[PDB]
Homo-oligomer: A and B are copies of this chain.
Amino acid sequence: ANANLFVSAENSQFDNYMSGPQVIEVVVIDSDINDTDEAKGEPDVTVNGKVLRMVQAVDGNWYGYFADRDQAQIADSTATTADSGLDFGVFCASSSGTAALGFSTTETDGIAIPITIANATATGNGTQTGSSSGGAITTTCAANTLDASTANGTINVVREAKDPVAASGSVSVGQIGLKNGTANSGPNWPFIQLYELNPTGNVVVQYNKGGGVQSTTLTFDTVDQFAELSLDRTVFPRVSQVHATITDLWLNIDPTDEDSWTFATNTKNTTSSFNVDTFYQVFDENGASGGSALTLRTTLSSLMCEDNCVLTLDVDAQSSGTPVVTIQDNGDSILTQLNASSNTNANNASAFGISTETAKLGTGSIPVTITEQGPNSGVFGTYDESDKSVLKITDNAK
């Protein structure tokens, strides 16, 4: 971890790899610049030789968030409703930094700010939804863009951001000049700086201080070689909990929060309209709503998924008539028995669904939810904090 520079992707287990639409947090912790009532200089931090702008927070630490340009654009196109699924907010040009954030972002490929567009002009006001293909960002953003915004805090890929240091005396907001410093509900903080990165190539983060430089190198590549599923036991008795653990680097989109994913896994739903699918943040880590369910099935190829973003389940493998596995509510999801008829019971996995999202996660199409065991771990599970799994063996199983 060096001494004073911390980068989220620095994990020995996964060999410093990063992949997909993920955001990366860079933190500087140093006692030379830790004060918040004096105007100390911004620390000098670069990624692949290009400047990373760092905001001071109330803990006396300097933060910056970056992501690959094309992956942010491609992922943002899935988020059809604002502040739900993988929303990076609105895509602005590099020149827009001075007019929108209040400081220069010119050595970046683009910036993602959490506002909404009221006046959808062709030129002066950025792109709300992003491009399914990606490319260069050319639409600019201005000061009148911020004021006209009707819903602030539309970024959903970073949800747990520290408060920017306040404006007192010589000190500006975030000590570098943010125009509005209300974190995770304001129009400026957090924001993601976009960089064009080379697949299968190294990414280098540097901090230049007196007496030497700290570096951290990361790899940008598909990470299906670090992905696996583990079950707690070999043989399962009749009313056991099925405790499934998924480890996948790709699934940790938020570096500050606990990431939640929801799957339609029924591989024997044969309705023509139905497809196995993946959804992002349909729930919280505390089993709240946390937003709508938005399709990701046809975009997983373009987000660097190599056979590693899909969960499928078969409740009755031998078609004996008695289903082995059922599903149940727990502390990290809101599952409901939609067929409450006396003729069926809790062993019918196809009688459960999600009430708010019935088009794609209704009756049948067994919804399965996983939650991140730690903000930036990359290890997911179906268990909750009371040890109640989503997947349970049926009472009449053979």
Chain B residues with Cβ under 8 A from A81's Cβ? none
A331 contacts B by Cβ under 8 Å: yes
**Contact string against B for A residues 67-93, beta-carbon threshold 8 Å, 1 for contact and 0 otherwise:** 000000000000000000000000000
Give bound CA distance, A168 to B172, whole Å.
11
A208 contacts B by Cβ under 8 Å: yes
B1 contacts A212, C-beta separation under 8 Å: yes
Please provide the chain A residues from 103 to 122 with a CB less than 8 Å away from any CB of chain B in the complex. Answer: 103-104, 106-107, 109
B33 contacts A33, C-beta separation under 8 Å: no
B3 contacts A210, C-beta separation under 8 Å: yes
Please provide the chain A residues from 50 to 72 with a CB less than 8 Å away from any CB of chain B in the complex. Answer: 50-51, 57-61, 63
The stretch of A273-281, A282-290, A297-305 in contact with B is A282-290
Q: A29-B44, A386-B197 are in contact. Are A374 and B213 (CB under 8 A)?
A: yes
The stretch of A35-43, A142-150, A338-346, A361-369 in contact with B is A35-43
B104 contacts A385, C-beta separation under 8 Å: no
Can you tell how many copies of this chain the complex includes?
3
Report the count of interface residues on A (CB-CB < 8 A): 85
- Of B6, B198, B285, B376, the residue contacting A385 (CB under 8 A) is B198
A310 contacts B by Cβ under 8 Å: no
Chain B residues with Cβ under 8 A from A232's Cβ? none
A196 contacts B by Cβ under 8 Å: yes
Chain B residues with Cβ under 8 A from A377's Cβ? 49
B34 contacts A40, C-beta separation under 8 Å: yes
A157 contacts B by Cβ under 8 Å: no
Which of A4, A106, A184, A197 is packed against the most chain B CB atoms within 10 Å?
A: A106
How many Å from the CB of A31 to the closest CB on chain B? 5
